[PDB]
Design a protein around this nucleic acid. Structure first.
Lengths: 59, 126, 50, 19, 56, 90, 187, 68, 65, 233
RNA sequence: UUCAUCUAGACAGCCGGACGGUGGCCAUGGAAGUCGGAAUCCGCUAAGGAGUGUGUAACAACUCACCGGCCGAAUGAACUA
RNA sequence: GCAGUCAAGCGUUCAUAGCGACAUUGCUUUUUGAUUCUUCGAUCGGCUCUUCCUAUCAUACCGAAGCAGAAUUCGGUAA
């Protein structure tokens, strides 16, 4: 697959009818942009969780 | 002058059709070609190779039944340089190439016919 | 316990440092797929995860 | 025959081995 | 800065225990024990061709 | 070249990036190698302009018929990509 | 196996004169003179006739025999150095920063001064050894030649040169700047 | 005066004809001549004049003289 | 960066002046240094060195076989 | 068993021949002596195998036996007593170096004219002056190195710069993949006794500008059983 | 200790040869002894692998395996203590 | 760990019994980095202050790494 030997020139993950991978790429870019705004740092943090909230949890 | 542009299955465009018209009907095979190059003129013609001549006489595979006389005609075709004394030895030289290709000469493996030659069961017209 | 912690620290450095071939961008995804064989990539990283 | 001495002893070695 | 060096003094307890270890291993080996080709006339001997003659 | 190579320049106080791609052959496309599929995916994905170099000349070891053939083969990728052709000199 | 006696021969050309008391060796020739102490070695010297000096070891082992051979080699090097001489050519290379190589005479001590190696302000000083002569080769870019009769001093000074300009904390596959020995030979 | 002046470092050598003085044994201060060499340490000596028997002897028992 | 840049760099400029001589000399001194590590490297490191050397001997024996 | 140099073993197909090959050559020359009429000695000190094969293909009826000098000396006879036929050590002593001992039944003059008219091109073969002189140009060096228009040739491969710099002692730099020098290096002058590295330089640049013509020294006829000496090149 | 090589010249060094069908067949953007898979033959030879490694995008070049020239007498491997 | 394979050697005065280094197979649960992460019966921890070991975390000097630089990983001397 990968390495100095690499007896792999062509894929098997190949779409025929060359316009089909264009239809795919546009769909994938739209899905990507959608996930970006769906799930949507600057040098500050949030304080530690108090140790009392873990009281039910104990060996 | 001379060059070799084997590359088959100045003015570098017209040489394409000059080469293809050296392989018009035959060959459809990766033969070796010699290009005698004058000023800008490509006098291109096939130089005989043993493997290509054998494969003419016959992923891809090979099983020939070359009939023991087409190999003799090939040996006559390229006893020119050949560095060998007799046709009876050039035939062995070509039968080795056939063994490497994987063909089946008459109906046996060509090493057995080399055995029959050097044992005294097969004759060669010298 | 120390021997366990060493191995899982090492493996976590592999898993988090390497990118998720899905979840990146389609262009980079397809490029790294044609380079590295996405199937082999994911299979190796799943082996390390398990 | 500085070499011939050695040559003779090699041959007698061979004779002994044969016997 | 050179480091320590082990000592060679034998501290009697050790040599008693070793004697006992060996006296036990000898019995164990004797218990497990319950479960020629003459090399010839070697070369470099100059007069080796004469030993072949006292046979008959 | 067996890979994509990148360069940058500044035009009109704006960073641009040019991408050289190794090569494409005419290749009926249900068999092609991982070097040409790089070029194909790059042309398909990115929001660029695209400059096809023709080299109108006997040089190149490639004929003008084959060049225009490749162009007509890969023009479906060009449907939204701002194409230009450049001749590099019957 | 305590070889009863082992010998090595040393050939002396006509112009050379060799003087050997206990194990000190003086060799005089056209290019100059050379001296060497070999009292650490415990061998024996002797002369045959003005062109052949023999060194011998009696009842010795492998290390003693090796010492005999290397003694022979050292004396042969002395003779070659006083007759022909030793000449080492070095070339200094750079990619971006031109290395400036000069000589300075500081308290009459003959230091070699290297500046701007890989873009540093440090000035690398290499003391020249006695019996060594530096010259900057003309009509050859960035080459320096060290000539003398002592192969030891010449080679050690060249080694000091190529060691003082070593690259530090950088991939040497990429960074090729340095001073390297191009050629060894005679005058 | 431009010839090589290598030293000699003379030595009393163990050789047939080398005469030796026996410093310890029954002879104890008699002369004998080395007639054969057995190894680095042993030789065969013979003094009939002073009356020592022909024998094998270590070299530590004798001391070589410069005479031969 | 951007591709096999050091391979390009070696093709264009080339490795050093003192590269092949030093590599030859390392390969030559390795014979001395292998034995040096054997008579040195007290403890676990010497044990592991011996293990590796034995395995390497067996591999070459099997290869020649 | 230690403090020795280890022999670098490698695993190839071919294997050494031994005494059987030499005995075979011995029997071959001795049975060909009885067969053919004339026997010749040819000094072939530095040859190409295609040239030797051309010489062999020139006649399939005649024989040519190469091999070891001391083996052919023994087959013929070096002493006047130890000999196969009469007046034969007189011939056997002529063999100098690489000797190709030929057998034939053909006329003397055909052989004599063939082996003086036969001449080929070859390298200059050090310890032999060359009839050529080469200053390399002071720019970029090409694969032929000053023998043809550079517009035909390509620059040599960058991998040869360590070789040229160290083994051939050429002062060499490289700017990008091309090899480069500052001044025109002269390698040789006509009538200059060549050395090893000069020969290797000319070989690397591909210069076969030396006249290979085989030398023949002697000749022996079985029916007459006489020697005859003719230095012909 | 055992087995081998050697004046029909051993071991080490230098030098030269190291070929021809043939750029052997599959494969590939390209692979010609040396990314890989599988054959692994014959010829001419003193000897020369459908090739031991470096290397090239591919060739090239170098190298060893093997042979020969010069050198002139001992040498190598595996084991035991 | 258990059960095996192979074979460098050892080998009742065994060729076809036995032993057996280095390698190596199966079982441990899965193949697509979704694992929600999930604990299951032990008959000590914290002050002052001193020293020692190195099996070195950092600092010092080096080696090898596709080590461009920057940062980092492995390792050598070093308490």
């Amino acid at each position: 697959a990968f390495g100095p030997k690499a007896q792999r020139k062509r894929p098997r993950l190949a779409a025929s009818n060359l316009e089909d991978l264009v239809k795919a790429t546009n769909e994938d870019i739209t899905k990507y942009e959608e996930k970006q705004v769906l799930d949507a740092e600057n040098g500050w943090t949030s304080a530690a969780k108090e140790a009392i909230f873990s009281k039910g949890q104990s060996k | 002058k001379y060059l070799y542009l084997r590359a088959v299955g100045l003015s570098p465009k017209k040489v394409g059709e000059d080469i293809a018209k050296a392989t018009k009907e035959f060959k459809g095979i990766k033969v070796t070609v010699q290009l005698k190059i004058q000023n800008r003129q490509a006098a291109a013609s096939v130089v005989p190779s043993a493997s290509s001549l054998v494969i003419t006489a016959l992923n891809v595979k090979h099983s020939g039944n070359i009939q023991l006389d087409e190999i003799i005609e090939i040996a006559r075709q390229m006893r020119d340089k050949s560095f060998g004394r007799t046709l009876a030895s050039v035939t062995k030289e070509i039968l080795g190439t056939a063994q490497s290709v994987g063909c089946r000469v008459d109906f046996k493996n060509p090493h057995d016919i080399i055995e029959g030659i050097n044992a005294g069961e097969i004759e060669i017209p010298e | 316990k120390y021997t366990g912690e060493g191995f899982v620290e090492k493996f976590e450095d592999i898993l988090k440092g390497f990118p998720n071939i899905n979840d990146v961008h389609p262009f980079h995804r397809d490029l790294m797929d044609t380079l590295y064989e996405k199937n082999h990539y994911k299979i190796s990283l799943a082996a390390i995860s398990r | 025959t500085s070499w011939e001495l050695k040559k003779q002893k090699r041959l007698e070695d061979k004779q002994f081995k044969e016997r | 800065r050179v480091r320590k060096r082990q000592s060679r003094r034998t501290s009697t307890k050790l040599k008693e225990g070793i004697k006992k270890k060996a006296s036990a291993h000898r019995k164990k080996e004797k218990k497990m024990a319950k479960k020629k080709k003459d090399p010839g006339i070697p070369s470099n001997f100059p007069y080796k061709a004469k030993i072949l003659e006292e046979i008959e | 070249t067996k890979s994509l190579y990148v360069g940058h320049f500044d035009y009109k106080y704006l960073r641009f990036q040019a991408i050289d791609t190794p090569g494409i052959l005419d290749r009926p496309t249900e068999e092609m190698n991982n070097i040409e599929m790089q070029s194909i995916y790059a042309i398909a994905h990115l929001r660029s302009c695209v400059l096809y170099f023709m080299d109108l000349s006997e040089q190149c070891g490639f004929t003008i018929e084959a060049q225009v053939k490749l162009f007509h083969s890969i023009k479906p990728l060009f449907a939204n990509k701002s194409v230009m052709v450049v001749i590099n000199t019957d | 196996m305590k070889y009863i006696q082992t010998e090595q021969q040393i050939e002396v050309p006509e112009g050379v004169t060799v003087s050997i008391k206990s194990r000190i060796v003086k060799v005089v020739g056209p290019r100059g003179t050379l001296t060497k102490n070999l009292k650490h070695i415990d061998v024996t010297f002797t002369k045959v006739n003005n062109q052949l000096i023999k060194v011998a070891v009696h009842n010795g082992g492998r290390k003693h025999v090796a010492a005999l051979r290397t003694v022979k080699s050292l004396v042969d090097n002395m003779i070659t150095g006083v007759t022909k001489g030793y000449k080492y050519k070095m070339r200094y290379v750079y990619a971006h920063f031109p290395i400036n190589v000069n000589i300075v005479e500081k308290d009459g001590a003959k230091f070699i001064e290297v500046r701007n190696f890989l873009g540093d302000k440090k000035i690398r000083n290499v003391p020249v050894r006695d019996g060594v002569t530096i010259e900057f080769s003309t009509n050859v870019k960035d080459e320096i030649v060290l000539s003398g009769n002592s192969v030891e001093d010449v080679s050690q000074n060249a080694a000091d040169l190529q060691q003082i300009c070593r690259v530090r904390n950088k991939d040497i596959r990429k960074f090729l700047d340095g001073i390297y020995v191009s050629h060894k030979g005679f005058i | 005066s431009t010839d090589s002046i290598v030293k000699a470092s003379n030595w009393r050598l163990v050789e047939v004809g080398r005469v030796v003085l026996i410093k310890k044994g029954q002879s104890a201060g008699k002369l004998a001549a080395i007639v054969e060499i057995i190894d680095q340490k042993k030789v065969l000596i013979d003094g009939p004049k002073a009356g020592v028997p022909r024998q094998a002897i270590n070299l530590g028992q004798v001391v070589l003289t410069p005479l031969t | 960066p951007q591709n096999d840049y050091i391979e390009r760099h070696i093709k264009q400029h080339g490795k050093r002046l003192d590269h092949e001589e030093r590599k030859r000399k390392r390969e030559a001194r390795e014979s001395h240094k292998i034995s040096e590590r054997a008579q040195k490297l007290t403890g676990w490191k010497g044990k592991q060195f011996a293990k590796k050397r034995y395995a390497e001997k067996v591999s070459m024996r099997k290869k020649i076989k | 068993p230690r403090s020795k140099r280890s022999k670098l073993v490698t695993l190839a197909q071919t294997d050494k021949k031994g005494r059987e090959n030499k005995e075979r050559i011995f029997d071959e020359v001795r049975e060909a002596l009885d067969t053919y009429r004339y026997v010749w000695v040819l000094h072939l000190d530095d040859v190409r195998t295609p040239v030797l094969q051309e010489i062999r293909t020139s006649w399939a009826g005649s024989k040519l036996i190469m091999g070891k000098r001391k083996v052919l000396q023994k087959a013929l006879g070096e002493k006047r007593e130890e000999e196969y036929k009469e007046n034969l050590y007189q011939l056997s002593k002529l063999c100098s170096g690489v000797t190709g001992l030929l057998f034939t039944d053909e006329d003397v003059n055909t052989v004599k004219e063939y082996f003086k008219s036969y001449v080929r091109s070859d390298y200059s073969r050090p310890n032999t002056k060359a009839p050529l002189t080469f200053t390399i140009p002071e720019g970029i060096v090409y694969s032929r190195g000053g023998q043809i228009p550079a517009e035909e040739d390509v620059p040599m491969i960058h991998s040869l710069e360590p070789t040229m710099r160290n083994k051939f002692e050429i002062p060499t730099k490289i700017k990008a993949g091309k090899i480069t020098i500052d001044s025109p290096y002269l390698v040789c002058t006509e009538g200059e006794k060549l050395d090893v590295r000069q020969a290797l330089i000319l070989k690397q640049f591909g210069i076969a500008a030396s006249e290979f013509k085989v030398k023949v020294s002697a000749y022996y006829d079985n029916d007459s059983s006489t020697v005859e000496s003719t230095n012909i090149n």
